[PDB]
Amino acid sequence: GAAADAATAAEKAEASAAQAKQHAADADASADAATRSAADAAASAATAR
Amino acid sequence: LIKQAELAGKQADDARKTAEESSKKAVDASQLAKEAAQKAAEETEAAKD
Amino acid sequence: AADYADESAAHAGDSAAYAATAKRNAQAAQEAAKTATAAVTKANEIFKL
């Protein structure tokens, strides 16, 4: 029974880690978009000057 | 026949002790698995934040 | 989280791996109990005869 519960916990932990990886992947997507936005902002600053 | 019963009694008892140790081990292991799962969950929540 | 998920799986794996064999000690104890019972049963039949 304890082993079965442990297995269940492990499956949930793996699922949680999988979500964490996706969350990090989404965080990267945001950071990459932010980097591009900042790069464009720098171009806008050069344009404004 | 009694002597054979005594021998059978001994391994039933040795098997019992082993099974009880297994129960404790499985429970400690499931506790560690749950804690590990919770630690993964905490990291997952941190990833979400 | 991934490392903790693997740790959780490792603990669950250890619990299940041991329990999966430790349960055979319960079966061995049952066999021993049946053996002791049989020894007594035979002893009782011999006595009566």
Side-chain angles (χ1 to χ4, degrees), chain A residues 1-4 6-7 9-10 13 15 17-18 20 24-25 27 29 31 33-34 38-39 41-43 45-46 48, chain B residues 5 8-9 11-12 15 19 26 29 33 36-37 40-41 46-47, chain C residues 1-2 5 9-10 12-13 16-17 19-20 22 26 28-29 32-33 36 38-39 43 46-47:
Chain B
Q11 293 177 335
Chain C
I46 292 164
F47 174 76

